[PDB]
Design a binder for these strands. Structure first.
Length: 48
DNA sequence: CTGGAGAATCCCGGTGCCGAGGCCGCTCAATTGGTCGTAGACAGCTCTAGCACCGCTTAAACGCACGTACGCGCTGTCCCCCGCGTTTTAACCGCCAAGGGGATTACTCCCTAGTCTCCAGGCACGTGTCACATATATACATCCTGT
């Protein structure tokens, strides 16, 4: 997260098949800049 | 002066993010219509500067000549910033309480301030002198001359 948060420009425009997030508690709230950064990530399937 | 690498740009096509534009709906602020004292414009009148000289005086600008001193280039070499790689660190998070701190809106109200008088005293103007600058008698005062 300390990385994808600010490099989302390169990852957002990608055709991910499975999106996996370990320790999803970092996305506990939608006011933390990660929930937003990771929300619109183009992916087919999502796993928390 | 080329190669020969080697990074750096930099085309160029791609793709969502989000500001730019547009549309809707009221509010308010510019228009309309009309009345009403000024602003200032314009037509004189005055007389103050502004301009235009002219002469005499001489400071000053000026050209020249003539060094010296400062300017520029050169040189040497020697410090202190540049380039770049590593360790450090501060700047971003995210967290976890529970509520206010303060611009913003609004309504009475009421002191303060405009407006508009009439005055009269205090400050622009005319005039009286006094401090500094100016130009001239003067009582000796230094060469010149009869003697």
């Amino acid at each position: 997260y300390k990385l994808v948060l600010q490099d989302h420009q390169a990852f957002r425009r990608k055709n991910w098949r499975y999106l996996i997030l370990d320790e999803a508690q970092n996305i506990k709230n939608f006011k933390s800049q990660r929930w937003q950064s990771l929300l619109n990530f183009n992916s087919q399937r999502r796993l928390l």
